[PDB]
């Protein structure tokens, strides 16, 4: 069906919807924790 | 089978409370009152005694 | 008879030529691991 066969499912899908809401704000410490789990991260913290 | 030594959730000792719990029930205590009398405040520990089945008593009926 | 041996799902052709039991294969229960990559499989040491 010329489309992906696997996607984001269950927790990650339910959480990514909450995560990308307009009113989700992360503190400096919270952000640095998440970037630890980003294998492709360039090591540069973006401007908040 | 036998009263677990510790509460599964928090690790409080409950294996010294089964006989006391039975005695309190013999004294017309309600189950909730008997658990309170024994100091089991967290409902995890109350679960241990309130739901225990003492099958070891049945097993002692069979001759060794 | 000979005819019975060759026909059917469990017959000689379908059961032993089109499909067959193989060496170097393992089977066990599967559990989630969000810390693996999509292209990784966590394997017990006993199977390895």
């Amino acid at each position: 069906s010329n489309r992906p066969v696997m996607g984001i499912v269950q927790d990650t899908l339910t959480a990514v919807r909450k995560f990308t809401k307009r009113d989700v704000f992360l503190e400096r410490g919270e952000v640095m924790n998440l970037l630890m789990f980003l294998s492709t991260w360039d090591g540069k913290v973006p401007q908040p | 089978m036998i009263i677990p030594v510790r509460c599964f959730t928090c690790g409080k000792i409950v294996g010294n409370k089964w006989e006391a719990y039975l005695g309190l029930l013999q004294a017309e205590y309600t189950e909730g009152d008997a658990l309170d009398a024994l100091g089991l405040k967290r409902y995890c520990c109350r679960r241990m005694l309130l739901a225990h089945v003492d099958l070891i008593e049945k097993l002692l009926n069979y001759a060794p | 008879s000979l005819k019975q041996r060759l026909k059917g799902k469990e017959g000689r052709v379908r059961g032993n030529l089109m499909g067959k039991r193989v060496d170097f294969s393992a089977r066990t229960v599967i559990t989630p691991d969000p810390n693996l990559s999509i292209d990784q499989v966590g394997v017990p040491r006993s199977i390895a």
Partner: protein, 115 residues
């Protein structure tokens, strides 16, 4: 059948380093600290103590896998400050806080016990 020994989560097997330091090539003044047989206990306090250092730009830790017993701590400091120096100062600050906490808890016990 495949159950690891319970002690394997806090005991180092022979030839295992408790902590190793690896420079982070992506950005300057960044090092990765791989600590063996440690969990969120030390990872969280070290990370939170580092975030209190104004010269630390990035502080973060992770347990790469719960079945493994490693914590990776990533520290990035300012050019005039070393990640290793930040790490040592963070532990001394934690040790000072814990030692002070021990002394003040002992006094509290004595006051409570006395009356």
């Amino acid at each position: 059948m495949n159950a690891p020994p319970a002690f394997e989560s806090f005991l180092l097997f022979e030839g295992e380093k408790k902590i190793t330091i690896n420079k982070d090539t992506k950005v300057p003044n960044a090092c990765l600290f791989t600590i063996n047989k440690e969990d969120h206990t030390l990872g969280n306090i070290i990370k939170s103590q580092l975030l209190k250092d104004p010269q630390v730009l990035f502080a973060g830790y992770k347990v790469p896998h719960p079945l493994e017993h490693k914590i990776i701590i990533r520290v990035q400091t300012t050019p005039d400050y070393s990640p290793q120096e930040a790490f040592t100062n963070a532990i001394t600050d934690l040790i000072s806080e814990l030692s002070l906490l021990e002394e003040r808890f002992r006094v509290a016990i004595k006051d409570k016990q006395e009356g």
